[PDB]
Design a protein around this ligand. Structure first.
Ligand SMILES: CCCCCC(=O)CC(=O)N[C@H]1CCOC1=O
Ligand SMILES: CCCCCC(=O)CC(=O)N[C@H]1CCOC1=O
Lengths: 235, 87, 235, 86
């Protein structure tokens, strides 16, 4: 059922640690409801941000034409606050208006119909989540719960902010300067005494720093330390 | 790439002796910032932006350190030995 | 004006930098609607987390006596999943059941009626935001937009999660539950021996935990330990 | 203050014993979560997000633990003594 898959999506989103995981969760929900693609869009006055699974070629065209200005979907989304169904079929098929070209292209890219969840945020900001299908009519707007729909939009919104945030590293997890040097010289085949002679770090303390490096990288031996460091691109 | 091969032993040795001191200088300075960064984060007082500034300085220094150390290793390989440099 | 004050609250929440700012914003909304208190509650399993403006002594009673398992409001929130009005003037007594004791104590603390916004979170987690009043019938459930009420609940939930993330505590600097209990019993005038009889911790070990608590907070004596703990809001 | 004073000694003793048992059950539960948090903060294998969850557990449990202790303290006050809890 739609709400059964929605409850599942909500659990999956909570567990998402990055965008890739959020995309997989949203793709599962979309598939389960009969859709293929999804798109999250956020409009803060002038700037517009999106997180979606629409095809690459369609995205370049969409941005390379500022189709935001003519998408009947966006215009309607701000014109209402309930989950609604839309179809490119209701747009101009003949004539030379910009919507007719928008129609032909959207459909050629599999974005023929869908349902959109619109929500007005703070400061007039606009947010929306759409699920699209290349088919004629796939409409869950009549079964989807209005309140859960908003809950889902809000989680996706906040989840994305809690990612767009800076990297933020933990000092304890990073190799210290003297640790990094002992490891690099070890990877260069230098002994503890030659390393000391080179860095100024005391000889007997060198092996101490290597053991420390191993703990941070979880390596049982120096050769494994080098392999891990190489794989993480640190040496 | 291997333009160190066309250098004389005297040129290479001088390059290594000064590259070794530089190596030691960066280490001392980098260790200081890391420890400070270690301390700052260890404090729930210091803000996020003041902790990020220290992280970036760490990421930046680590980068130059890698580049400087790689170069020193190439000089030493072309030289064929490690000159004794006082502390 | 209710939904108007709601949109205003939404903006105030976005600009809120800390817990104090969120309380101010929530309190203003409450007053404009005819209430005088609010409470945000999150429940996972037997663990309850709160953020409210209900009186301190009521929190001690509610949290300390597990009222979450007897409170008709939490019960109502999981039987139905939409905004609802509730009043103690609807939980008949006619006896000395734990239910009458709960009702009378809530009343004595100024909590008589309210409206609650319930939302089922991820992994069986339950959350809700309520506005309470000591008067008999302050009901805005009939005019509060359901979708907007959910939005507010999600905003409060994530804003709080974001402010909590702004502070990373190092366990090595925090008192352990053991040290904490010994510090509170001392602040209540209990000797090491009386404390040991309450906690199950040996009398000599109690003095040892107080010593560790002092080193963590840099106190030279227990009266100082208590002073510094009070100043930091630990206890 | 008067919530418990209104009860007799035999009613209070029963409540106190029960409350002391809970006081100890919560202590053992919370101390364990704290030791996992303390251990994790030194384990490079744990991510900040997982760590933050432990921190929030410690904080939620601390508030509840203080509340139950305040409730037990008030019972003790009306009872007059600390009963033996086997
Ligand atoms: C490419 C990222 C654009 C996302 C646009 C959006 O959110 C709304 C939407 O589905 N518009 C549809 C309708 C025809 O083409 C689309 O893409
Ligand atoms: C200690 C803060 C508790 C908050 C509890 C809550 O969210 C639901 C609620 O309003 N319960 C009401 C009804 C009688 O007393 C209350 O507090």
């Amino acid at each position: 059922s739609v709400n059964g898959n929605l409850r599942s999506l909500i659990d999956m989103l909570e567990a998402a640690q990055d965008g890739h995981m959020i995309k997989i969760a949203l793709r599962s929900f979309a598939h389960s409801c009969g859709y293929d693609r999804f798109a999250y869009l956020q409009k803060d006055g002038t700037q517009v941000r999106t997180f979606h699974s629409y095809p690459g070629p369609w995205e370049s065209i969409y941005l390379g034409s500022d189709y935001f200005n003519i998408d009947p979907v966006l215009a309607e989304a701000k014109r209402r606050r309930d989950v609604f169904f839309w179809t490119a079929d209701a747009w101009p098929a003949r004539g030379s208006s910009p919507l007719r070209r928008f129609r032909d292209e959207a459909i050629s890219h599999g974005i023929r119909c869908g349902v959109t969840i619109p929500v007005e945020g703070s400061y007039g900001s606009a947010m929306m989540l759409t699920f699209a299908s290349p088919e004629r009519k796939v409409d869950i707007s009549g079964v989807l719960d209005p309140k859960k729909a908003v809950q889902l939009l809000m989680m996706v919104h906040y989840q994305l902010k809690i990612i767009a945030a800076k990297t933020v590293l933990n000092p304890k997890q990073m190799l210290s300067p003297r640790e990094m040097l002992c490891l690099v010289w070890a990877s260069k085949g230098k002994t503890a005494s030659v390393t000391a002679n080179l860095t100024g770090i005391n000889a007997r303390t060198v092996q101490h720093y290597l053991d420390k490096a191993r703990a941070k990288l979880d390596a049982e031996s120096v050769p494994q330390l080098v392999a891990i460091a190489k794989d993480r691109g640190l040496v | 790439e291997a333009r160190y091969s066309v250098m004389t032993k005297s040129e290479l040795e001088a390059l290594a002796v000064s590259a070794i001191r530089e190596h030691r200088r960066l280490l001392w300075a980098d260790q200081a910032v890391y420890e400070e960064w270690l301390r700052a984060s260890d404090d729930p007082s210091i803000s996020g932006p003041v902790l990020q500034t220290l992280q970036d300085e760490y990421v930046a220094r680590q980068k130059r350190s890698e580049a400087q150390q790689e170069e020193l290793s190439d000089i030493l390989d072309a030289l064929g030995f490690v000159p004794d440099v006082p502390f």
